[PDB]
Design a protein around this ligand. Structure first.
Ligand code: GSH
Ligand code: GSH
Lengths: 221, 221
């Protein structure tokens, strides 16, 4: 059928978790970068963005917007959303925790200059005291290589992605969590994920001041 | 069986959409209201809350936290999450838009007072120009009574709940959307929803200043 086509700007932002999930699933996809406000405005005008926002992914005849809609579909299509309703419940609880922490970190460079330092410290206390203990506890509960059902799921991929971002923020936050470190290593060594982590893949770099200014002139904030 | 048990404070907050969904489904439930910081410490120390937060719902032997994990489980169990993964994609896309708008409205009372006037204006412009147009377009395109699949789903319930909140904010905003007004009426007349809407149900009132102070006392924010 059609190769999925990912519409976003040339940055991580809200599309990166999708690039991770598709890559991990071994699914070939294409990207179409929005480079100007005019590119975005054409997509809006032409009715391809339900809420006038991206990310948008063209897949299986849909113009799918909303990150969780995109990810839920891709996870189901490629058997990374568990085997039944009860496994999906555990997966959803786990990844919604990942989303909450992820969202905090995502928005840190948006924080007013004089609130930024205190926001970082609150994120670090949450990582150390709430999120990393919760996920370490799951991995210690069963002692297995994957978070849910002894099988690779989206939860492992989303979690490992976030451990990369936490590492960029402060490399010591993970030090007291040996099962999380071991998960990061194993998932990073899955053939598909390894290729994703290697140069020339669609994986995107940390946003710098000049990619931030591009966001500003496209999405106008 | 055993009725779902909903752990939250006696208020709408992040638990109201689950009350709406269970009620719509015809599912009888129990609530255990958190009334003190001590009540919450106890849920936390007892290991009931994966990320130390509520909502939490005890259902079918699980202690489910995270709103979306709770709702996704309920919706699948009671056949309100569509017939296959493509209808689920449409439902997710729609309801995530509803979630974004809902979140703006939910958080409005905690907006810095200096920001409330401008933000309320932005929210009304997004209702009139972004969200209501998107759902009216979906309804106009297929001419059917329900958002997805010509059949009741969670999307119809979540949207109608939101239409009630928008009506609370400003009753004029829906005026130029006849299809949304018709959806509101039809759904509000389904026996389960009609009963939920009548005095005496578990439906909660608008958060006032004192319910908000209660929350500060309990969650120490
Ligand atoms: N809840 C949405 C949020 C999407 C979103 O905020 N997109 C931004 C780009 S990251 C956007 O298009 N902003 C333009 C606008 O809101 O008008 C999702 O997760 O997909
Ligand atoms: N993404 C979570 C958010 C949960 C949340 O923020 N819960 C609040 C109460 S509405 C809480 O328990 N706060 C206490 C805390 O975070 O320490 C969900 O949707 O369930």
């Amino acid at each position: 059928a059609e190769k999925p086509k990912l519409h976003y700007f040339n940055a991580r932002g809200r599309m990166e978790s999708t690039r991770w999930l598709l890559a991990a699933a071994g699914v070939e996809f294409e990207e179409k970068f929005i480079k100007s406000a005019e590119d975005l405005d054409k997509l809006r005008n032409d009715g391809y963005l339900m809420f006038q926002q991206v990310p948008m992914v063209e897949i299986d005849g849909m113009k799918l917007v909303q990150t969780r809609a995109i990810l839920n579909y891709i996870a189901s299509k490629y058997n990374l959303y568990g085997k039944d309703i009860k496994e999906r419940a555990l997966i959803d609880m786990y990844i919604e925790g990942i989303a909450d922490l992820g969202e905090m970190i995502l928005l840190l460079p948006v924080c007013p200059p004089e609130e930024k330092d205190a926001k970082l410290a609150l994120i670090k206390e949450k990582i150390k005291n709430r999120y990393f203990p919760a996920f370490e506890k799951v991995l210690k509960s069963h002692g297995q290589d994957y978070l849910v059902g002894n099988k690779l799921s989206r939860a492992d991929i989303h979690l490992v992605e976030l451990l990369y971002y936490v590492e960029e923020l402060d490399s010591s936050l993970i030090s007291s969590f040996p099962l999380l470190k071991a998960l990061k290593t194993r998932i990073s060594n899955l053939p598909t994920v390894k290729k994703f982590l290697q140069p020339g893949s669609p994986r995107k770099p940390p946003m710098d001041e000049k990619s931030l200014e591009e966001a500003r002139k496209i999405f106008r904030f």
